[PDB]
Structures are given as C-alpha cells and as structure tokens.
Amino acid sequence: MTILFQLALAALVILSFVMVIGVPVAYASPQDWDRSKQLIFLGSGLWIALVLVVGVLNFFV
Amino acid sequence: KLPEAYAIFDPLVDVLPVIPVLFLALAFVWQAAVGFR
C-alpha cells in the first residue's frame, strides 16, 4: 500500500501544519474557547491516530 | 539515504534542522509585535 501510506503521511504533514499554526492561536485567543478546545481535542486524537497509522503502514510497505 | 517509501519528503527533511533557530527569531517577532513592552 504505497499510495495509502504516502497519503497518510501527507495527511499527517498537513494536520501537523494545522496544529502547529492553529493550537497557539487558539490557546492565546480565549474567546468562544469551547469550540476551539473541542477542535484541538479532535486534532490531537487524529494526529496520534495518524502517527500510529503511518508507523504500521511503514511496516506494511 | 531515507527509506525508499520516504522519498518525496527529502526537501522537507532538508529544511527540518533549521527550524529551532527560527524559534529564536520568532521570539523577537513576537517582541516586535508588542513593541518590546
């Protein structure tokens, strides 16, 4: 699954860019922070899952 | 080199070690945004 693993790594890179550029701008802007907090929780969970998926797909290439 | 599946990320890996230095620069940018108060 070369195409699947490369897509997973690209999604990991894009999500890491979003979290890098979006977590501090939500931590330092506390207005309407419940939606920001749930977005950060979803982003962190998806990032951990993407790391695990990239590792196992690397093992499956 | 890198493992052969990790082949299109060579430019990204090439610019990765530079990044901590930018953090230092980022502090000054932040300090310029608040006017060095």
Partner: peptide
C-alpha cells in the same frame, strides 16, 4: 532546488503567520 526553498519559505511564513493572526484577533499575544 525549488522544493527546499518553497518548504523553508512556507515554514518561515508560518511563524509570522501565527504572530499576524494573533495580532489581528487581539488575543493574549
């Protein structure tokens, strides 16, 4: 090569992009 310069320009914009977004949103910058 164009890819390495593009990536380093992207990251070196991404830092000041955080600063600019926080300045616009009037946060705890």
């Amino acid at each position: 090569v164009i890819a390495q310069l593009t990536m380093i320009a992207m990251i070196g914009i991404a830092g000041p992009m955080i600063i600019f977004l926080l300045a616009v949103r009037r946060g705890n910058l």
